[PDB]
Ligand binder design. Structure first.
Ligand SMILES: Nc1ncnc2c1ncn2[C@@H]1O[C@H](CSCC[C@H](N)C(=O)O)[C@@H](O)[C@H]1O
Ligand SMILES: Nc1ncnc2c1ncn2[C@@H]1O[C@H](CSCC[C@H](N)C(=O)O)[C@@H](O)[C@H]1O
Ligand SMILES: COc1cc(/C=C/CO)cc(OC)c1O
Ligand SMILES: COc1cc(/C=C/CO)cc(OC)c1O
Lengths: 354, 360
């Protein structure tokens, strides 16, 4: 029918679906979205030739090649567009920023999700996808099949991707934690907080900024900590969390549990229980898997991240709120609180006492 | 109506940026599903309910990996979120809920039909490592000029396919399966091949289209013309004469020349050179039959438009000046190469069939 026509066209759209994130990657790497944000008012539009005039190029085709990339981004509403008729009767397009561009260009604090997109579309993280069929048939982890070691060991050998990853995570966490800290009061009154797997320390620096008397420890692998900027109030410390974690009044773990199997999460969580005082807690910041494969963007983000963990991590996966309760119970915690949520990230507390 | 920025609108904007960041997971997970034969296993193995569990799928894979079922479930859950497959939920003994899966309407074109073809080989082409590589050179092409594919490989795509036998095969089969489906539909509706003595398919690939034309019109002389490395492989279809060459030098003579998905591979200058060659290869009453997408008036959100604009982005990555064109632009190419008549004759699956008529 028109029915068969629609099914065929959707199949073609799926086949070429990687054109969208790769076009967007090129637009971000060329600084297009920043040039648009600084060159016209928030509600205005700019031509591809005026954008290209701010790139360091003499390529006569740069305007049309940008138009082609921007038209693909416009079709998905990543940028806005308006049409302007030409004397020939042909029409050209001028482009503006759509609401998603607020998160793809630097905000008042100089952060966005653009480094996160540059991480997600890096050649290094695309390669494991070619080994997913093998891992399903033969066992194993697609990343390890591509690289011969686990991802964190690999990042300790490839300095470029270590920095790309750490910056991707730091920028994404800055945006999420800025929102959580406006709503969540669970750090108030702590003497010491430990960010286990804290990366380059962005979250711990924001906690100490909000609560200047808190003593904060940012704990991660030593190839990450070596790149961590100094921040007043934060002590950076290298190590392996599965051997033990630093003591504190609370331990914060953001996007750690979803990297690991249930068994490895229990080992880590018991190390955290051992590190806390009797009345201490673990503050767990993670997505929560929805109950069905619904088409919403928020659910797609979680299920995309579940698929990433499948490709990258040994046993990592997304979990439901009950599955998080089960991890807390089996590692000895007695209370469980869903305390706040921001950009899909829920903040749960695993309380040693209830 | 103006949407006033709020917490709620900022959540949706943030999440769409995260979805974009990881959007390649969808075609790469669908690639793995197809390579594992999961959609074919589902099509052939429905219980009479029409829904199958990941364990039941896994049981049919050449595997003894006991994590295969849960791995499949996770892949299928991403596919189901995008309506590539369907699901149903069933409550387990422990009170946990399991998913069972079914084929969604798109799967009619991702599994073999009655003629044994689908768009599955096209998806394997589009997601092949070789064709993902040029995307890392897109920013370079914009800043330096040139072609992302040539920056990755040090030669043009056709030259590269002549050096890499595995990808040449993957490409020729992706195109022949796709073109078989579209051509079957065009041949039901379009009458322009009737009464021709000789048809030349220029850039015909392995010749699937020429073989369809002669099957329908057994009195026609059919020539399949392409590069020697494509022709070498090509099935010896009854009634098709294969000829290797380079179309920019010239093309075989015929009453009509058919070019499907050729113009969109090449710059305007290249197209003018090709279409002048065609003009010279035709009798006075001859025509070029051109099967291509047509760019819509605006970058609207429809799937049909998106397909054309995805293909425009594929041509930017792969091809020497290739791009999608509007009907007015195809008309301008026809006039600029000497043709006096132009008509849009038919359309199937977004592919329009245009005729460039030597005499109007
Ligand atoms: N065995 C281990 N000990 C300590 N940290 C580890 C680890 N294995 C992995 N990690 C760290 O776990 C972090 C996971 S990514 C999450 C980073 C940060 N919490 C955020 O949300 O931005 C990485 O920084 C990684 O280096
Ligand atoms: N210079 C040239 N002369 C002849 N054919 C060429 C050519 N350069 C590229 N091609 C061919 O152009 C075809 C483009 S792909 C489209 C193939 C076929 N018409 C279909 O629609 O299925 C390929 O088969 C390629 O080898
Ligand atoms: C492997 O560690 C992670 C990798 C990735 C992979 C990012 C590439 O899209 C994402 C994460 O949070 C979503 C992680 O904790
Ligand atoms: C190199 O020429 C083509 C490449 C491609 C690339 C297919 C991979 O998505 C598609 C075509 O028709 C759509 C072409 O004529």
């Amino acid at each position: 029918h028109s029915s068969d026509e629609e099914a065929n066209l959707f199949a073609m759209q799926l086949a070429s679906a990687a054109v969208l994130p790769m076009a967007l990657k090129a637009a971000i790497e060329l600084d297009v979205l920043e040039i648009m944000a600084k060159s016209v008012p928030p509600s205005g539009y700019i031509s591809p030739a005026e954008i290209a005039a701010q790139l360091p190029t003499t390529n006569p085709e740069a305007p049309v090649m940008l138009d082609r990339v921007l038209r693909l981004l416009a079709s998905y509403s990543v940028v806005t567009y308006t049409l302007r008729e030409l004397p020939s009767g042909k029409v050209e397009r001028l482009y503006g920023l759509a609401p998603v561009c607020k998160f793809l260009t630097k905000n008042e604090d100089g952060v966005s999700l653009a480094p996160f997109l540059l991480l997600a579309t890096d050649k290094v993280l695309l390669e494991p996808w070619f080994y997913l069929k093998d891992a399903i048939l033969e066992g194993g982890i697609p990343f390890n099949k591509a690289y011969g070691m686990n991802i964190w060991d690999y990042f300790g050998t490839d300095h470029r991707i270590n920095k790309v990853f750490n910056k991707g995570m730091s920028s994404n966490s800055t945006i999420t934690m800025k929102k959580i800290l406006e709503m969540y009061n669970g750090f108030e009154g702590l003497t010491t907080i430990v960010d286990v797997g804290g990366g380059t320390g962005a979250v711990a620096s924001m906690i100490v900024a909000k609560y200047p008397s808190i003593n904060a420890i940012n704990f991660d692998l030593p190839h990450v900590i070596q790149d961590a900027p100094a921040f007043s109030g934060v002590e950076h410390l290298g190590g392996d969390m599965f051997d033990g974690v630093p003591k504190g009044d609370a331990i914060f773990i953001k996007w750690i549990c979803h990297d690991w199997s249930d068994e490895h999460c229990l080992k880590l969580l018991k190390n955290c229980y051992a590190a806390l005082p009797d009345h201490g807690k673990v503050i767990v910041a993670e997505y929560i898997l929805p109950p069905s494969p619904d088409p919403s963007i928020a659910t797609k983000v979680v299920i995309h991240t579940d698929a990433l963990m499948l490709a990258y991590n040994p046993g990592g996966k997304e979990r439901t709120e009950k599955e998080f309760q089960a991890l807390a119970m089996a590692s000895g915690f007695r209370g469980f609180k869903v305390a706040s949520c921001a950009f899909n990230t829920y903040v749960m507390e695993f309380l040693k006492t209830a």
